[PDB]
Design a protein around this ligand. Structure first.
Ligand SMILES: [Cl-]
Ligand SMILES: [Cl-]
Ligand SMILES: [Cl-]
Ligand SMILES: [Mg+2]
Ligand SMILES: [Mg+2]
Ligand SMILES: [Mg+2]
Ligand SMILES: [Mg+2]
Ligand SMILES: [Mg+2]
Ligand SMILES: [Mg+2]
Lengths: 345, 344
């Protein structure tokens, strides 16, 4: 009846529940646009699979199901935890890439949660609730998967040679899988330490974004989480320092930048708080990030990695940053984007 | 030697250590200017005594020393944890009041971590460093004090009818003393829970500064710390909400303010972070405070105190706020001043 339905999910991984909702969508529309959220990020335990991997998984399960792939299109969405309007527009762009001169368009979202959000943000499309009487727990799936087990009742395919089932079987023979398991164990041990604390803690960290001649200073991580990923230099706030002091302390600690306090104090543009509750796999971590801008500087200050940085580099803006946009810790690509727009550049 | 020596301290309480520094100062100079830090706040466990009480104690201890009091001058300083220039301007105000006929001026520094700050902040003046005798610990003294014990070695006077000894002896019979002991026991028991855990945890709180028709919304506190003090509505950030969400949640839980979420979102001017390490006695607590301004409204919205607020009130800017400046929780008077100045 509608020309286009719009379906949004993370699909980490795709499972029977996602499938049911796509079946409902197609009983109500001729074509379903599948938008995959949280694309263009490096693998982490919550988001182990890339856009292309998830897209391939979905296609293989829809064929198992077997839904005609001409009735299905798949598009990526980046994370915009702090810029909802960019996400809203990015979704629109995905749809109108496929929608034609006054196609009817409906979002086949969720009668329970998030419905309110889509209704308000997309008044111009209709809404179809589906929800959602079977509890397909994405976290529970991954936890067993990190323990070597693929939960069959989630899998569209019952044959390990096919579908997402097949993808996951092969994926367990990879180095990335081994890295995910290592990160996961790190996270389990970390959380265990905090079990008999009277309250769940909100952790506080700091980062420094240092721009010198359109080059960003980035460290390559030694430790979990985000082992081997690139990140802004930063770390935990200690109990006896101000945030402003911490930002500078961690910067020197990890990069040994050849600049003085006063030079950085002159260069400081702003601090911003990043508080999206799921930004970090460790627990609830809030980051305060200072922007420091140096223009027409005589050269790039000397730097060398130490403490929890195993490498450190100046990285020119434009192509070299965009290039590692999916090799960055947590939400740092978003943080860099926002500070350069709001306080930069 | 110097016309003028400058002495800065908390003096919670004045002790033997302070007395000798001033004596050294009185041979190295003609007149001492004593600047008492952290004045104009409510009593709390780290700052149990007011300006007037500390001054009194100082004077009476000095007569028992038995130092001339034309030699000695005492002035207050407020806290400005987030505006150090203001702090420096009031110190300079204090000194300039007593020293403007080109006098020689030196700062005599009896605190060790503050020495560098003073050297950097006041180069117009000389700095005389005094590494004191034994360790007269203010915290230890206060803790023994909240356990019924005056440490006799700290005291200047040996007679409980003279000096700060007399003052403190008498103070133990007061309601303020009981309030502090009660605040102290809460904190000790609070910290007890919290060593249960891998790392010293920074706490994260939120507050809301809501102004309507030039009135600020304030809560009187049901619970420790700062029981019965006036405060911005606020409390602990929950793990599953954003800061902006939490600010509004605590505001509604504590005041039941009759405005919608959307009205508050439209009124919202900014959000600032206050992160002075010793702002709260509980442990290290960073607060994010949202400012909400309704330049005008038909009336002051209905408010009803709930949860950890025992009363709630619209208090008008200017004199009504200034008259409770020393009945506010922690750094809230500073927070209010800053948000109005810069956000604003
Ligand atoms: Cl997980
Ligand atoms: Cl760190
Ligand atoms: Cl609370
Ligand atoms: Mg670090
Ligand atoms: Mg570090
Ligand atoms: Mg660190
Ligand atoms: Mg509260
Ligand atoms: Mg509360
Ligand atoms: Mg609360």
């Amino acid at each position: 009846m509608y020309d286009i339905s719009v379906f949004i999910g993370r699909f980490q991984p795709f499972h029977k529940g996602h499938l049911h909702n796509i079946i409902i969508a197609l009983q109500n529309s001729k074509k379903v646009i599948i938008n995959i959220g949280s694309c263009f990020n490096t693998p982490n335990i919550k988001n182990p699979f890339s856009f292309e991997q998830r897209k391939q998984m979905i296609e293989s399960d829809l064929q198992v199901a077997g839904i005609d792939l001409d009735t299905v299109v798949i598009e990526p969405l980046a994370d915009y935890f702090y810029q909802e309007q960019k996400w809203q527009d990015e979704l629109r762009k995905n749809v109108y890439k496929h929608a034609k001169n006054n196609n009817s368009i409906a979002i086949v979202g969720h009668i329970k949660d998030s419905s309110s959000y889509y209704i308000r943000s997309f008044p111009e499309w209709d809404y179809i609730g589906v929800d959602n009487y079977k509890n397909f727990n994405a976290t529970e799936f991954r936890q067993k998967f990190y323990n070597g087990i693929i939960s069959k009742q989630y899998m569209c395919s019952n044959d390990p040679k096919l579908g997402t089932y097949n993808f996951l079987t092969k994926f367990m023979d990879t180095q990335v899988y081994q890295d995910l398991v290592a990160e996961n164990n790190y996270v389990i041990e970390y959380k265990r330490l905090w079990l008999k604390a009277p309250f769940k803690p909100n952790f506080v960290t700091v980062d420094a974004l240092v721009i010198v001649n359109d080059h960003i200073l980035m460290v390559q991580r030694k430790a979990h989480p985000g082992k081997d990923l690139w990140a802004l230099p930063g770390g935990f706030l200690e109990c006896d320092e101000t945030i402003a002091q911490a930002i500078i302390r961690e910067l020197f600690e990890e990069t040994n930048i050849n600049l003085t306090h006063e030079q950085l104090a002159i260069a400081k543009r702003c601090e911003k708080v990043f508080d999206y509750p799921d930004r970090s796999v460790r627990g609830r971590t809030i980051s305060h990030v200072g922007l420091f801008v140096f223009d027409q500087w005589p050269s790039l200050p000397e730097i060398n990695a130490a403490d929890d940085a195993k490498d450190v580099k100046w990285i020119s803006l434009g192509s070299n940053i965009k290039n590692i946009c999916d090799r960055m810790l947590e939400d740092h690509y978003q943080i860099i984007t926002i500070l350069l727009e709001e306080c930069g550049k």
